[PDB]
Each structure stands twice: as structure tokens, then as C-alpha cells.
Amino acid sequence: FDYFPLRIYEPNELPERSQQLTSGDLPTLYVFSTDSDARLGLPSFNPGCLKWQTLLRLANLDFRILPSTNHSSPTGSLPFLLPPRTSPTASPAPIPASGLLSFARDLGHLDADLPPRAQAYLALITHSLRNAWLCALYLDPTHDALLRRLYVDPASSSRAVRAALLHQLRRAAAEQVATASSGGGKIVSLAPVDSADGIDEEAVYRSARDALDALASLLRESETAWFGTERPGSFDAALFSYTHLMVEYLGRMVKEAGNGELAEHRERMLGVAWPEWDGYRR
Amino acid sequence: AVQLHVWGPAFGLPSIDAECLAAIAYLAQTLGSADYQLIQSSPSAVPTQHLPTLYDSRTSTWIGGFTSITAHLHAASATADGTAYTAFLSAHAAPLLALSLYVSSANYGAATRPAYSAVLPLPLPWTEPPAVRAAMARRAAHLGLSSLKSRIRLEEAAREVLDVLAEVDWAAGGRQVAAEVRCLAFGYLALMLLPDVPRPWLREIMEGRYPALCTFVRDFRARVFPQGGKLLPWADGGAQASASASASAVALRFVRAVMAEVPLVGEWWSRWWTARKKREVLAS
Amino acid sequence: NAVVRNIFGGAETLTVNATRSAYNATFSTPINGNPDLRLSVEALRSATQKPWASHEEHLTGANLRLAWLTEKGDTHALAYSSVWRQLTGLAPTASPTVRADAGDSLKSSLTHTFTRDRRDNPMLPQSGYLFRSVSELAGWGPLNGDVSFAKTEVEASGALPVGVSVGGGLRLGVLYPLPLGYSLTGAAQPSRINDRFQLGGPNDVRGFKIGGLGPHDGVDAVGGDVFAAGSVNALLPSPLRLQLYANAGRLVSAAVFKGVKSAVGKLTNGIPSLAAGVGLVYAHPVARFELNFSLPLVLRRGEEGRKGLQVGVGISFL
């Protein structure tokens, strides 16, 4: 061709909203937190994200925490990471939830092929305990105030939109519970059953009381204060992702599982993950 | 005088689904031929709409699901393992099952569709097997596999389950579990082995690698299900004539399903129906 | 489409279901007999895609509009709008400026569109001159919501024959954040990506990509508050005639004030982008096709200017 660009000048000085948020000096994990307790680094309140944050804080990674809104993400799920920015107009690619431990690097214990037995219990955590958190948070009018204070109020602040969001949450939560056979395999249409009546708050809750009885029975056999190991692994962090959020916000079942095993274990993960914090127990 | 509602006798196992087959094995081992009735039915023939359903004649309550049914009729590491595996079979094993006989088209249309059409009334197979396939496919997610050298992924997605189910010592050893979770394994490990399909990729894996399961599933059926499981106290009409208490009702089953398929008012009509139906359970 | 030419008087309804979608349940009506004061009520819903800032945008609101055509050619149109503006498409490699703005908002606003058009052919200027103002005041005081700004935009073209028809052009714009309640003081929240201006491509400044010529965050073109653009044509010669354009352009309470006085102070420091190139105009009764050939000259680093064969069509060029 030819040399037509005759003068090329400096970069163009990115806007204001993209200098306060994305300035960046440390890897910035994006979780479901609130602005007051996102600076102190306090745990999130969405267990699918508290799990990964706990793993990273166990991974000895020093990093920031910033709230976000589930659309800004390489995939559907939220807890991704964004490495520091190298030049004021160009950044390295995000890191999806799956590779947070590939970027965090004797860190082999946090990601290992679990024994064939404890891989069976992880069903209790991801399927039996996860449904009690969905059924009791979204589809329980008692927690109508709590759900509103976390997932919608910091979103739009316009009563005609909060309600449009709130209805799209419960329509999604009642779906992911109505599929796992703990609550109901009700067959009703060539369509998912997204309603608080396609399930039953009894079957889901009774399994969760049986879950926390099985899990509490596994810990008494370990005699090393963690689930058959020496240091918190990927199985301790997955249970703490649920045994905490249900205690900070079902609560009397955790503290009464077995003889206090799941309540004491949770108070010994906030001695390895958050060593300077105070103010748990609701 | 309990009264269970199950599916049909299709593939030589007095049921066509893992839940109801598991419940049938449990009842046949525990209660006795003079206690239940096994009224073959359909999901749109019960208030619970979750088909394996106990109806207690004494107090007239509907109890949906296999776990809740086992809530009636009844070291600690034993029951710990029991709960663990009972929660590991309802997921990571129902999707592996549903991957065949419910998703693979070459297998869904030669043995399962005749199975369903041979256990319902005349006009129903036009609507219900679609819903059943939709449900079993929605639960068949979380695996990344679809209707498919693109088969090593299949064998791996089968090992990730059979390896966990292998170290149970289902019949004797390793770790004895319980009398309610064993009857659940045979509920899934039968429809994953016994069917005669035209596209077999689940039989040879288990028959060729896991002998401990092949013997149990064959020995178990040899214990409580001799000669096809007809000796069970079916309804008075017989196997096929079991669904006699419900041409008048069969029309209502047809109109209810098809009306829920109109584009806009369909969804709301469905939500009004199941909401009305469920309030019959709690009142019962 | 779908129309209704009367219900009671001179009213009308409508519906268009056509970017990825739109559903405009428009319902127009004249008021007080006069066939000019066309009052409208629209309730749209659309999910348009914007690739230059790699995401989507789901407008799901409704706006009330009141048009008016005086007897001198000019046209006032005072519109009130309320939308949703959800951004839910950041699947590809999107830049960390758009990952801070996926979010959700409301944008209650109030505009005013004033276009005195004296040009003979609206698609091909020969001797006329267009003036057009679009003043917009988003959520502030009575208008609630969660965006709060004040946006204006002026465009004043020209033309002069001596058929040869030397041309011309100009555009302007300023986006000013304002506090959220019944005051001129307080917190002035900085502007998001659905409100900043865009400037580039074959419709605005010929010689750059459809979104380039602005502050770039890598590959995505985040906008800017204040801006300005020019142009100069020749329109040398049936509607098929040739053209010689040489465009230009830029794109960039005591706190929010010294921010604007600084930007527009920077708006006159250095040669603007100042592309160039020739083309062939075709004055269709509904469109203006260009099929040009461009050679950009000056650039702010990272702004993705094309280098020829920039065919583009529309109604409002520069």
C-alpha cells in the first residue's frame, strides 16, 4: 500500500468510571459482595462464589474483591478474576471460575482427585445442601426482606425494575431445585416447572437435615480436625461455602449437626482463612 | 393396605423408571404380598404428579418420591454411607441413565417408545413420552454430552460414575450400607444393564469391566423378581388391566396436557393447575 | 406492520415486529383538531447488538412523545422516555471497561428535538442549510431513576452552488453529569457506557471504523463526554454525482465542572483526526448511497481507521 497515516498522537485518556473501578494493582476477584464489606475483604454471601474466594484465600493469593452483577463474566457464573492492568488502555484476558487455581500458581492439595468415597459425599454438598439454600432463600416469604437487601436493591433502585428482577430470580431458583430429585420430579409440561408449588419445602428440608447428619458423621472419623487430611482442601471449602452462609444468615441445624462438628469446623476455617476478622454468628 | 402407583412392566423389570422400580423392590422385600396393590398409573393420574407415590388407605395421604415413601414404612458410618450414596444416585446417576433410553435418538424410538405406548391408554402416548423425554434431557445436562472419537468422553463419563458405585460391596466386605439404599442401586443398575436396545454402549462397560455389579444386578433380580416379576400383587385386573379405575378420565388427561401447550395462556394455565393440585396434598 | 386509520377522530394505532427485534405499539393522535400537534405514545422492546463495544443492549421501556410542526419548516418534539437498558452479551473478549458496566439502569429522561430544514433535497444538499438540536435531561429532580446527566447536540450543515454545490458541515455535543435530587450541588455520578457519545464510521466521520475515533480500551470503543466534528465537500456531478470530503473530529460540583472545562479545553489542542477521501453520491428518494474511497491522515493511537471502499448508506450524513 502506502504510508498514509501522517501523524499518530498519544492514547486517548479513558473515561472517569473506568479509572476508579479498573485502575488495578492486584488481581481483582469479582464476587457477589456489598460495597461496605468489599473493602475489608469480608466473605461474600453467595455460596457458589464464597467457595472460590475461600479456596483462593487458602491458596495464599493476595487480591482485591469487587462486587459485580452476573452479566459481566466470561461465562454465565460470576466469580471470575481479572489480572492487573499492564498499560492504561490494554488488559490481560479474564480468568474464568475454573482456572482460578491455575492462575494462583505445594499447592496440589486444593485440587486433587478425591478418593472414590468422598466423591460420593460431595453429592450431599452440591445437591442436597445446595437445594436447601435455594428453597429457603428465594422461595420462602420469611426471607423476602433478606433476598431484597442483597440481590436487587444494589441493582436498579426503581420499584418497577426491582420487581421485574425479583420475579426473574425466583423463576430461576425454583427451576434448579425442581430438577434435582430431592424435592420433586413432577412431570407437568414439555417445559420446566418454575414455581414454588412444583416442589415441596418438606422433602427438600428433610434431606438437608439428613445431609448435615451424614457430613457431621464423616468429620468425627478424621481425628485431624479436617475431612480426612491435614490442611483445608477442596472439600472443606465446599462445605464451608454453605455451613457459613446458613449460619451468618437452617441455622440451628448446623450448630446441632451431630454434637457441634459442623459449627466448630466452621469456626476453625475462620482461623485459617480470615485470621483477623470478628463479627460472625448472625 | 398401602397403595403404590408405578409404571409398566416394559423391559422385564416390573417398572420402566429407576425410582418406582426401587420402591417396588423395597416393598417386595419388606412388607408382603398382602399389604400393597401396585396400581399402574401415569403422572397425570395422581395429585403429587411425581409418579412413584404411596397412598396410605388408613389416613388418605399422598406421599411423592421414593425418599419420602421410605420416610413412612419405617456403627453410624453405615447410615452415613447410606445417605451419601442415596444422594449420589439421584444425581450423577440419573443423568448417566437418561443419557441412554431418554436422549440417544437411536435408542429412544425402538425400545422405550414401545415401552411407554404399551403401558398407557390409547390417546395418552401422544403427549406424555414427550414430557418424559424433556424432563430426562433437562436432567441430562451438567455433562456436556449430547446425541452423538467422541466416545472416549462417553466411556469417561461412565467411569466417573461406575467407579464410585463399584466400591460399595452391594451384596454380601467393603462397607455394608442399608436395606433401603441397596434397593435403590438395583433401581438404577437394572435399567442401565438389562434393556435390549439397538445402540448398546452401557452394557459392555459394566459387563466388561465391573463384574461385582453384573453379578449383583443378576443375583438380585433372581431373588425378588423371578419370571418377570408378575408374582407381585398387581391390581385385580392384571398387569395391563391394572389401570382400570382410571375412557372418561383418560380424556381429561388428554385435554389437560394439550391445553398447557398453547403459546401465551398455557404457562399460566399450568401454574394454576399444579398450584391447585398441590394444595390437595397438604390437606390430605 | 399494522395500522388503523381511525378510532374516533384522526387517531391511529400501529405495531411493528422487526439488530434483533422491536415491538413498537405506537398509538398516535392529533390534539385539538389541528393536524400538526401529533401526540404519540410508544412502548418498545428491543434487543439491539452493538459490536464496537462488544456487548448487547436490551431496551425494554416506553416513551411518550409530542411532536409539533410550525409553519416555517421547523419542528419541535418534546419527548419523555423511560427505558431499561440491560447489557447482557459480554461473551467475547470484552474489555474491562465494559465488564464494569454490564449492570442495569432506568434512564428516565426528557428530550427536545428541533430541526429547521431549509435544504431543497433532503438527501443531497445543493443550497439549503439544516439546523438541529437535541437537548436531553435525564433523571433529575422529578425524573427519578439512577442516571442523572444533561446532554445536548447541535448540527448545522450548509451548501452553496456556483451545478457544483460546495458543501460543508458541523456537529457538537456535551454530556454533563448532574446530581440526583432537586439541586445543582452534591454527588455527580460519572457517566456510563450507554450514555457516552460515539463518533466514527461512514455516517459521521468518513474514514474510520463504525465506532473508532474515541477513547479505546483495547478493542472496544467506549465513548466520551464532549466532542466535535466537521466536514467539507465538493459534490461535483441524474442523482449520481461524485464527492470530495475532508472530515475531522474529536471525542474525549466543583469536581464535575473542572472536568468539563478541562476536556473542552483539551478539545482544541492538536490537529484533529482529519481524514479525507472521494466518493460517488446517489440521491435515492429514501436513501443516500456513498461507495467512497478514504485515506485517513491523523490519528490518536488505537483508533482503527479504514483505508478505502467504505460503502455506506443512510439519511443523515456529515
Residue numbers in the entry:
A (entry chain A): 24 to 128, 141 to 262, 264 to 285, 301 to 333
B (entry chain C): 2 to 75, 105 to 178, 237 to 260, 263 to 336, 339 to 376
C (entry chain B): 156 to 173, 179 to 322, 332 to 406, 414 to 428, 447 to 512
Give me lines lifted from the publication on this model.
Sam50 forms a 16-stranded β-barrel which is minimally closed between strands β1 and β16.
In addition to using lipid nanodiscs, we determined the SAM complex structure in the detergent GDN using cryoEM.
